[PDB]
């Protein structure tokens, strides 16, 4: 599933992890 809103803080670490790891997301 997908969801942010949480990220709004752009400090979101989970996506942050998946971000530096980009392909890590999907």
UniProtKB/Swiss-Prot annotation:
Positions bearing Phosphoserine: 22
Effect of residue 6 to W: In congenital heart malformations
Tissue localization of expression: Expressed at intercalated disks in the heart (at protein level). Expressed in the fetal cochlea.
Cellular compartment(s): Cell membrane; Cell junction, Gap junction; Endoplasmic reticulum
PTM annotation, UniProt: Sumoylated with SUMO1, SUMO2 and SUMO3, which may regulate the level of functional Cx43 gap junctions at the plasma membrane. May be desumoylated by SENP1 or SENP2.
Modified residues (Phosphotyrosine): 14
Highest taxon of the lineage: Eukaryota
Signal peptide stretch: none
Covalent link (Glycyl lysine isopeptide (Lys-Gly) (interchain with G-Cter in SUMO)) residue numbers: 4
Coiled coil: none
Disease tied to this entry: Oculodentodigital dysplasia: A disease characterized by a typical facial appearance and variable involvement of the eyes, dentition, and fingers. Characteristic facial features include a narrow, pinched nose with hypoplastic alae nasi, prominent columella and thin anteverted nares together with a narrow nasal bridge, and prominent epicanthic folds giving the impression of hypertelorism. The teeth are usually small and carious. Typical eye findings include microphthalmia and microcornea. Oculodentodigital dysplasia, autosomal recessive: A disease characterized by a typical facial appearance and variable involvement of the eyes, dentition, and fingers. Characteristic facial features include a narrow, pinched nose with hypoplastic alae nasi, prominent columella and thin anteverted nares together with a narrow nasal bridge, and prominent epicanthic folds giving the impression of hypertelorism. The teeth are usually small and carious. Typical eye findings include microphthalmia and microcornea.
Subunit-structure text: A connexon is composed of a hexamer of connexins. Interacts (via C-terminus) with TJP1. Interacts (via C-terminus) with SRC (via SH3 domain). Interacts (not ubiquitinated) with UBQLN4 (via UBA domain). Interacts with SGSM3 and CNST. Interacts with RIC1/CIP150. Interacts with CSNK1D. Interacts with NOV. Interacts with TMEM65. Interacts with ANK3/ANKG and PKP2.
UniProt record similarity statement: Belongs to the connexin family. Alpha-type (group II) subfamily.
Record function comment: Gap junction protein that acts as a regulator of bladder capacity. A gap junction consists of a cluster of closely packed pairs of transmembrane channels, the connexons, through which materials of low MW diffuse from one cell to a neighboring cell. May play a critical role in the physiology of hearing by participating in the recycling of potassium to the cochlear endolymph. Negative regulator of bladder functional capacity: acts by enhancing intercellular electrical and chemical transmission, thus sensitizing bladder muscles to cholinergic neural stimuli and causing them to contract.
Protein known as: Gap junction alpha-1 protein
Annotated source species: Homo sapiens (Human)
Section of the entire sequence shown: 234 to 259 of 382
């Amino acid at each position: 599933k997908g969801v942010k809103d949480r990220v709004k803080g752009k400090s979101d670490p989970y996506h942050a992890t998946s971000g530096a790891l980009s392909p890590a997301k999907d």
